């Protein structure tokens, strides 16, 4: 689990603070809807 803080135009490049680790610039997963992912929303990121 991690918490989103922002979103960007074109490739969203949502940047997420894990909870103590780092600000991670993670792209959305292939099998997800971009609209469903939202700024200021808790999200789950696969480490691998």
Binding-site ranges for another protein (CB under 8 A)? 11, 13, 15, 17, 21-27, 45, 47-48
Q: Are 44 and 22 in contact (CB under 8 A)?
A: no
Cβ at position 27, least distance to another protein in Å: 5
- Pairing type for strands 2-6 and 42-43 reads antiparallel
Cβ at position 25, least distance to another protein in Å: 4
Q: Which residues contact 21 (CB under 8 A, 6 or more apart)?
A: none
> For another protein, which is the closer residue by CB, 13 or 42?
13
Cβ at position 37, least distance to another protein in Å: 14
């Amino acid at each position: 689990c991690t918490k989103i803080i922002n979103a960007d135009s074109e490739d969203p490049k949502y940047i997420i603070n894990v909870k103590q680790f780092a600000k991670f610039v993670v792209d959305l997963s292939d099998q997800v809807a971009p609209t469903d992912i939202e700024e200021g929303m808790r999200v789950g990121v696969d480490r691998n």
